[PDB]
Amino acid sequence: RARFVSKKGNCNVAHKNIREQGRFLQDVFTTLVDLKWPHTLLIFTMSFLCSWLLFAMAWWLIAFAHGDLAPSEGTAEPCVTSIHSFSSAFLFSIEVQVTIGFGGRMVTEECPLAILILIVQNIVGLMINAIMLGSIFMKTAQAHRRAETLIFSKHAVIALRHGRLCFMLRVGDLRKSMIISATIHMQVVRKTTSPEGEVVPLHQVDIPMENGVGGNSIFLVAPLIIYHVIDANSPLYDLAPSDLHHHQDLEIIVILEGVVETTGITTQARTSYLADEILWGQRFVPIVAEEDGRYSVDYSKFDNTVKVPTPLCTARQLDED
Amino acid sequence: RARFVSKKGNCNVAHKNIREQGRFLQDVFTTLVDLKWPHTLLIFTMSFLCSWLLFAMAWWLIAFAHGDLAPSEGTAEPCVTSIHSFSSAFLFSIEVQVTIGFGGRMVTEECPLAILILIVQNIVGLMINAIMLGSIFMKTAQAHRRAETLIFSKHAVIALRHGRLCFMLRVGDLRKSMIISATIHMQVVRKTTSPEGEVVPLHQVDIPMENGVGGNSIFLVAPLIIYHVIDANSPLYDLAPSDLHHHQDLEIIVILEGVVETTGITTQARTSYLADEILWGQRFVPIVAEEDGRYSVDYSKFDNTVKVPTPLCTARQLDED
Amino acid sequence: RARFVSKKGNCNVAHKNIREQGRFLQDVFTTLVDLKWPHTLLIFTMSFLCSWLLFAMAWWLIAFAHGDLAPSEGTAEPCVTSIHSFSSAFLFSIEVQVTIGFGGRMVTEECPLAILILIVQNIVGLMINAIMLGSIFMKTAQAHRRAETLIFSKHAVIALRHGRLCFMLRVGDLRKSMIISATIHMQVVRKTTSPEGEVVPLHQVDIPMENGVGGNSIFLVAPLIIYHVIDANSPLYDLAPSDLHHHQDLEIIVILEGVVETTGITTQARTSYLADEILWGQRFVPIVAEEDGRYSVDYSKFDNTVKVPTPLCTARQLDED
Amino acid sequence: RARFVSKKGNCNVAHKNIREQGRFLQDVFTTLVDLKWPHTLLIFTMSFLCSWLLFAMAWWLIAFAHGDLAPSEGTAEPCVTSIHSFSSAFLFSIEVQVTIGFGGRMVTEECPLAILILIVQNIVGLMINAIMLGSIFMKTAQAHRRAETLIFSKHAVIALRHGRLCFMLRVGDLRKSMIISATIHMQVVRKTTSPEGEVVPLHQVDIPMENGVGGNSIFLVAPLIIYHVIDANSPLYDLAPSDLHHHQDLEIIVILEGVVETTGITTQARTSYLADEILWGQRFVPIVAEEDGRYSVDYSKFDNTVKVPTPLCTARQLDED
Amino acid sequence: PLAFCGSENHSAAYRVDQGVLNNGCFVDALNVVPHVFLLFITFPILFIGWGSQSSKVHIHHSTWLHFPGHNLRWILTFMLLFVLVCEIAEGILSDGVTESHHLHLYMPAGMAFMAAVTSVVYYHNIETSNFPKLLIALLVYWTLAFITKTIKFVKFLDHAIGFSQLRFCLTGLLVILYGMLLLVEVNVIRVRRYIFFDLGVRFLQPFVNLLSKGTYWWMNAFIKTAHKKPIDL
Amino acid sequence: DLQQLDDTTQLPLLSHFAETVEGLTTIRAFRYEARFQQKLLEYTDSNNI
């Protein structure tokens, strides 16, 4: 009825009634990176423009304190030359802080407070330059956009394999760059009761991916079939083919995560498979073929299932001969 | 009682009598990054301002030794134009090393030693710029501030689940950005004594997190119940319910570690549970509901505990009915 | 006839018929790092030169709209000084955007839309400098070039070790630096059928690397011999020595992956061993010796093998006398 | 006599006879970070100074080709203003490439080829700025010098604990910041023989660290006595106390690797233990005490021993009464 | 206005037409440069190495090693501080006779005074941490300060300023004092050769530095922690 | 507090002398002269501390 993880990868959780809002202000950097793109563009150009405006008001108060804006002059040199407006001091603070430095307006050595506010504007401009260009590079360089190009299967399947019944989905990679140390964590989620009376509303039970050693690692070049074998330890052991309908609380989330080879920053791709989206008795078509010295992968045949003769009873009842 | 790590996550060790300070001088960058923030901004603006003073003194000595500072002149073209001060050469070192470059003070072609000082100032200013702006980005961008928004339960419970006593607590993520490949390490810390007479004061021996695959790898989106089954191999096998008081030598530390999805830097969040903070016979309230097509998490009820009947003896004696 | 991964490590896959091409534009950054090197230098020069030409047309339209290009002037000051061409405005946009700022062409306080064009040019030039300089450093700093200095053996051998058949190969590090937490994943990949009628064309099944502790982690300082003992649960259990011909579907790919010590960016080296490259009955020569206090590794002796008398039966047949 | 790893952690290998030198040139970046510190300072200032000299020769050929160097002039303006030497063009190349921009020498709009040389100098100066400042940051920010602040015990011990013989040693961290997900791979390396006749001269066989869960991961706050219990599957099963002499071929290397909390770069600390640094029958003192509500670590008692009574025989002889 | 050697003269005394280092302002500005070298080689390595020892990484208090010549090094450093504060007061009495703050009389002696205090606390922070793998920066400071003081002394001997004017006698004392502060040749060659050639006692008086033998700086810890604790045996 | 620590180390040395002069013939019988010299070594050491 209401799903946990959406099929592109967003988790549908609300996070209501959060008591301590004061611990969000003890990390300003993860909140600064985790904003949306018009918010990070507004805090980018508003932080740069408010630093230029604050130091432009400082240079305007320096030239007002020396009397430089009042043009009744004799021969005394101003401590910034050729300021006679606010907007000249705004062009001077723009020329100082991002280090353009034209030379119609330069600092002479009269006011020592001008040399102090030049040192302070260069130090706060180097801090704002380092933190903001590193923050926009960490914003555009983060690895959550690698989950858009990791195409999963649309439907997962449960089929016969090697005497057992195996829960199969199909992952796929799209790029010539690989993904280093890709792991798989398949979790079931359902509203479980305990035998002793505990009710967990989303009890996340990890099921093993069958691999050969038991450990969860894959080599993702070809679109391979991730398969989980249903033994008696696995919580899909009493699943009926008539149980796989809508309004059935059974959901398998598949979490694929690894280090992207190009960036070096670890990604996570995730999906879900609800109880109507699991096809019983079908299996995936082989899509990999050997041609002209290479291996063809046909991505148009990705979710295509062929029907298998399959026993229509539960996996506990396949242990009854 | 003197606890090992605190409730926030900072440890309580004293680290007395360190024999060699040379191992602290073999690396300087972790000492530079690992300072506090009024040390870090002080070493930042002190390194920049003292580098501008040192190269400012070098430009003042070159403009001394060419005789540029004497206004008694011929009509020879001088070394660097309109320097007639120390502080104008300090303004020239600010115009070179920040690469502002205004233009009333420019390098002439007269001395080659001024071109040597300009090469050494541009090389050392590029090196000081690279090291200090990358160090302040590594100081801001580190991942130990992500532990402030990973809440834990304040109290841990021990209750019956599936016939066994289970050491249950609750971890919690609070924001929208996930933590990739999160791993729970739960360790018991207490002073134990061997049967061969070996006494160790903080015997950090592990307990296994009961997961369903055995390996510790969680998918923390919703706040979930981390639980550890009390087994004969587990060293909480002989815990009496009257043991849970103050001045009892028993502490349980939880270590949660993973990589932040946004920043890409591996974090570590940790907490403690003393013997008076373990409440026997209770269990956590279900805090997850679903509303208008989305799951809702009631975070205000996060450590609310509900007492159940629970057999008041050890789990060794729960094997004896 | 056509190998999956080659001996260098590139993958011989095609990835034909990719339907969803709209998700390639959802990550522009990993596609931007994933170009080749003349495409990277072309997008670097074209991004910088197109941004200077766009703001050059903006400054030329500003000096056209103020009439400063028309040299029949009174004593009204221009928006930008000494501008009377397009190419002088292109030199001015070069002087703004990479922050040179010469000063014969400077901006004055007559023109507020010029100050708005200067603000937008400084913000867009700082963003283009941040993303393009970080993309150049993440392009040249990635770790797929670390696999050029990771040598493998050109052959793999099957001989006897501790009575049993072991599949041995010789990985070697070439450099003085280490590779931190280096893991080996050996995946024998062939076209396997199911018992129940499913054909998988490239069925990647794992084999455990024999470490003694089971978990695949090594210490690649000296070139060590990675071996997998052919157990009854291994898929090389029925491999006869008549099956080591060419035109044979059998391929073992070896995935060395770890973190480089100098960069900190995770690498992955991959190679392959076809069935004519697997030699029965040979074993590796001892290439490690010791002289004047150090260990000496002759790297010219690296893929040299020596024939020993092994049996010519299967490992199933080696369990029956 | 000739050990594998020294006690500081530097590995004593020779790497004789590297045949393919041309595969070192396929990664210039790991050679660029992997140089020593005066070599990386020399390639830093030689790269910047040679790029300034190459573009200074380009600007000098531009001003020679226009005829700017002739003092017999009319009124046609030069394409670079105020060049009348080579060294004025060298100061102009310094003013362009690190973007100082003084403005007594500037580009005018006569030559198009000077605008092309300005575009090429700004692009090549931004690329050399990105690669050289990121390479000097990755040189000063790598994590192998963090391994100096991790102290090991200088001797290792073997004692009685829980009925068995346990190879114990003491690791220790001297810093306040943690090392996240710190793993231990204790390896024992000696020259082995096969039963079939294969002689492997440097055979790294792993011993498992006993932790309690079967995984090797520690939580390093206090210095802890890490230990390996000698089983029949371990290869310390036949070690006698009479085999703890010098010139016994037995080396045990302990590798500690993890993620630093300060930088985020993965580190590795390693050491070794010979047969005469292993002391039989001893154990470490308990050094951790509590004081004023915190624990206290007295680091001067780090390797002091107490010499407990121990059965002076092998661990195989422990299994026979 | 505060310039080096005044704007009070006919126009300036900055001109170098006799040559370099015939100007007294130029030989005093050359006398500045090892003290600003020792300050900008000493203050970051001291702030990194021993400003990091905060609470919860405290100190070791045993095996104060005492690199030799230690008593005569601190006795010579206190004689160097006495002759430098005499050069401060001699430059102040030289400055006050006219006008306009001729700044080169007391600014190099004040920078030498601050370099002498940071040299002795840099030597104490080396000597309590017991590794000699530094201290050659202090050696090249003493050779740089020796060559700049002997070039000031030989340009005082050139113009016959000998022994009646007191800056000849004070630069002669500082030349022989920097020559006896080339005592670091005993630390590199004669003893302990680093370049190329106890118990639970808590008394700490006969093995401590000579200022803490003098003004008892180890007893500040015992007078500190006898508050909020009673002292048992 | 250090003056009171000096009085509480100054008392058992004089009480040790008042023990050992009255019990001299029985400390020369039970031959513990080296052990009593070790005890006065500890007492005068703590007094001088």
Residues B137, B147 within the same domain: no
Residues A84, A3 within the same domain: no
CA dist list (Å): E126 to A185, E116, E188, F38? 54, 15, 15, 41
Any idea how long chain F is?
49
For helices A37-65 and C112-140, the axis angle rounded to 10 degrees is 130
> Residue holding tokens 């093995």?
E207
β-sheet bridge partners, residue B161 = B164
What six digits make up the tokens of A37?
């793109």
Q: What is the CA radius of gyration of chain E?
A: 22
The DSSP annotation for E32-100 comes to HHHHHHHHHHHHHHHHHHSSS--TTS----S-----SSHHHHHHHHHHHHHHHHHHHHHHHHHHTTSSS
Host domain of residue A206: 1-13+143-321
What six digits make up the tokens of F33?
């002269």
Q: Which of B31, B54, B69 sits opposite E14 (nearest CB)?
A: B69
Neighbours of chain D (3+ CB pairs under 8 A): A, B, C, E
Q: Which of E56, E60, E62 sits opposite D176 (nearest CB)?
A: E56
**Longest Cα separation, chain F:** 41
Instruction: Using CB atoms within 10 Å of the CB of residue D252, give its burial: 0 to 12 exposed, 13 to 18 middle, 19+ buried.
Output: buried
> How big is the A-C interface in CB pairs under 8 Å?
204
Contact C261 D268 (CB under 8 A): yes
- Stretch (H or E) spanning C44: helix C37-65
What CA–CA distance (Å, rounded) separates E170 from E158?
16
Residues B3, B132 within the same domain: no
Residues C270, C187 within the same domain: yes
What CA–CA distance (Å, rounded) separates A297 from A171?
13
* Minimal C-alpha gap between C102 and chain B (Å): 8
> Residue holding tokens 């290009």?
C69
Any idea how long chain E is?
233
Long-range contacts of D285-289, Cβ-Cβ distance < 8 Å, separation of 24 or more: D286/B199, D286/B200, D286/B201, D287/B201, D287/D223, D288/B201, D288/B202, D288/D222, D289/B201
Contact A44 C123 (CB under 8 A): yes
Three-state SS string across A241-293, please?
CCCCCCCCCCEEEEEEEEEECCCCCEEEEEEEEECCCEEECEEECCCEEEECC
> Residue holding tokens 């069925």?
C203
Residues B81, B210 within the same domain: no
What six digits make up the tokens of D14?
């020779």
What CA–CA distance (Å, rounded) separates B98 from D270?
42
What six digits make up the tokens of C310?
């092994």
3-state secondary structure of B279: strand
CA dist list (Å): B153 to B96, B157, B276, B278, B283? 56, 10, 14, 11, 12
| Alpha-helix residue ranges (DSSP H) falling in chain D | 29-33, 37-65, 87-97, 113-140, 315-318
Residue D24: CB atoms within 10 Å: 15
Q: What is the CA radius of gyration of chain F?
A: 12
What six digits make up the tokens of C247?
């035109």
What CA–CA distance (Å, rounded) separates C164 from C146?
34
List CB contacts (< 8 A) between F46 and chain E: 233
Residues B266, B207 within the same domain: yes
Number of domains, chain B: 2
* Neighbouring residues of E205: CB distance < 8 A, sequence distance ≥ 6: E213, E218
What CA–CA distance (Å, rounded) separates B41 from B30?
16
Q: Are E155 and E29 in contact (CB under 8 A)?
A: no
What six digits make up the tokens of A270?
């995730």
Domain end among C142, C161, C181: C142
* Minimal C-alpha gap between C257 and chain D (Å): 14
- Nearest Cα to Cα of residue D258 among D156, D170, D171: D171
Instruction: Using CB atoms within 10 Å of the CB of residue D310, give its burial: 0 to 12 exposed, 13 to 18 middle, 19+ buried.
Output: middle
The DSSP annotation for C149-203 comes to GEE--SSEEEEEETTEEEEEEE-EE-SSS-EEEEEEEEEEEEEEE-SSS-EEEEE
Any idea how long chain D is?
321
* Neighbouring residues of C91: CB distance < 8 A, sequence distance ≥ 6: C105, D107, D108, D109, D115, D118
Interface of B with C (CB under 8 A): 99-103
* Minimal C-alpha gap between D282 and chain B (Å): 11
List CB contacts (< 8 A) between C103 and chain B: 102-103
β-sheet bridge partners, residue C257 = C183, C268
Task: Kindly report the backbone phi and psi dihedral angles of residue B73, in degrees, each rounded to the nearest multiple of 5, phi listed first.
Answer: -130, 170
Residues B153, B283 within the same domain: yes
- Nearest Cα to Cα of residue D261 among E44, C40, A180, B9: B9
Contact C99 B103 (CB under 8 A): no
Q: Are A48 and A40 in contact (CB under 8 A)?
A: no
Q: Are D190 and D197 in contact (CB under 8 A)?
A: no
3-state secondary structure of A49: helix
What CA–CA distance (Å, rounded) separates D283 from D286?
9
β-sheet bridge partners, residue A260 = A179
Contact A99 D102 (CB under 8 A): no
Interface of E with B (CB under 8 A): 3-4, 11-12, 14-17, 20, 25-26, 29-30, 32-33, 36, 40, 43-45, 47-53, 56-62, 129-131, 133
Residues D81, D8 within the same domain: no
Residue E138: CB atoms within 10 Å: 18
* Minimal C-alpha gap between D101 and chain A (Å): 8
Residues D1, D28 within the same domain: no
Question: Pairing state of beta strands D217-218 and C288-291?
Answer: unpaired
- Nearest Cα to Cα of residue C281 among C305, C303, C310: C310
Domain end among C119, C142, C165: C142
* Neighbouring residues of E30: CB distance < 8 A, sequence distance ≥ 6: B61, E21, E148, E151, E152
What CA–CA distance (Å, rounded) separates C224 from C217?
12
Contact B61 E58 (CB under 8 A): no
- Nearest Cα to Cα of residue D204 among D270, D145, D283, D282: D270
CA D300 to chain centre: 27
Neighbours of chain B (3+ CB pairs under 8 A): A, C, D, E
Rounded to a whole number of angstroms, the distance between the first and last alpha carbons of chain F is 14
3-state secondary structure of C130: helix
Residues C112, C162 within the same domain: no
The region that residue A258 occupies, defined by phi over 0 for left and psi between -120 and 50 for alpha, beta otherwise, is beta
What CA–CA distance (Å, rounded) separates E112 from B179?
56
What CA–CA distance (Å, rounded) separates B139 from A127?
12
Buried (b) or exposed (e) across C263-272, using 16+ Cβ within 10 A?
bbbbbbbbbb
What CA–CA distance (Å, rounded) separates D182 from D188?
20
List CB contacts (< 8 A) between D300 and chain E: 60, 62
Q: Which amino acid type is present at position C85?
A: S
- Nearest Cα to Cα of residue A169 among A181, A151, A189: A151
- Stretch (H or E) spanning A206: strand A199-207
* Neighbouring residues of F39: CB distance < 8 A, sequence distance ≥ 6: F16
3-state secondary structure of D1: coil
Q: Which amino acid type is present at position A230?
A: I
- Nearest Cα to Cα of residue D173 among D155, D156, D149: D149
Q: Are E209 and E70 in contact (CB under 8 A)?
A: yes
Task: Kindly report the backbone phi and psi dihedral angles of residue F15, in degrees, each rounded to the nearest multiple of 5, phi listed first.
Answer: -75, -25
- Nearest Cα to Cα of residue B227 among B151, B312, B316, B165: B165
3-state secondary structure of C225: strand
* Minimal C-alpha gap between B101 and chain C (Å): 8
3-state secondary structure of B180: strand
List CB contacts (< 8 A) between A99 and chain D: 99
Residue F2: CB atoms within 10 Å: 9
| Alpha-helix residue ranges (DSSP H) falling in chain B | 29-33, 37-65, 87-97, 112-140
Strand intervals (E) in D142-293: 150-152, 156-161, 164-173, 179-193, 199-206, 217-218, 224-229, 251-260, 266-273, 278-280, 288-291
What is the experimental resolution, given in Å to one decimal place?
A: 3.7
Tell which residues of chain D come right before a gap with C–N over 2.5 A.
Answer: none
Contact D99 C98 (CB under 8 A): yes
What CA–CA distance (Å, rounded) separates C158 from C239?
11
Any idea how long chain C is?
321
Q: Are A226 and A184 in contact (CB under 8 A)?
A: yes
3-state secondary structure of D4: coil
Neighbours of chain F (3+ CB pairs under 8 A): E
List CB contacts (< 8 A) between E60 and chain D: 300
Residues A49, A65 within the same domain: yes
List CB contacts (< 8 A) between D175 and chain E: 57
What CA–CA distance (Å, rounded) separates C192 from C304?
33
What CA–CA distance (Å, rounded) separates B220 from A317?
34
What CA–CA distance (Å, rounded) separates D295 from B15?
9
Task: Kindly report the backbone phi and psi dihedral angles of residue D184, in degrees, each rounded to the nearest multiple of 5, phi listed first.
Answer: -125, 125
Rounded to a whole number of angstroms, the distance between the first and last alpha carbons of chain E is 63
Residue D163: CB atoms within 10 Å: 11
What CA–CA distance (Å, rounded) separates C202 from A223?
10
> Residue holding tokens 């060294």?
D87
Instruction: Using CB atoms within 10 Å of the CB of residue D47, give its burial: 0 to 12 exposed, 13 to 18 middle, 19+ buried.
Output: middle
Contact D130 C136 (CB under 8 A): yes
Residues A135, A164 within the same domain: no
What six digits make up the tokens of B226?
């981390």
* Neighbouring residues of B132: CB distance < 8 A, sequence distance ≥ 6: B44, B47, B48
CA dist list (Å): D135 to D141, D264, E212? 10, 17, 47
Instruction: Using CB atoms within 10 Å of the CB of residue E208, give its burial: 0 to 12 exposed, 13 to 18 middle, 19+ buried.
Output: middle
What CA–CA distance (Å, rounded) separates C204 from A220?
10
Buried (b) or exposed (e) across B54-92, using 16+ Cβ within 10 A?
bbbbbbbbbbbbbbbbbeeeeeeebbbbbbbbbebbbbb
- Nearest Cα to Cα of residue B31 among A235, A98, D149: D149
What CA–CA distance (Å, rounded) separates D209 from D225?
11
Buried (b) or exposed (e) across A177-209, using 16+ Cβ within 10 A?
bbbbbbbbbbbbbbebebebebebbbbbbbbbb
What CA–CA distance (Å, rounded) separates B23 from D149?
6
Any idea how long chain A is?
321
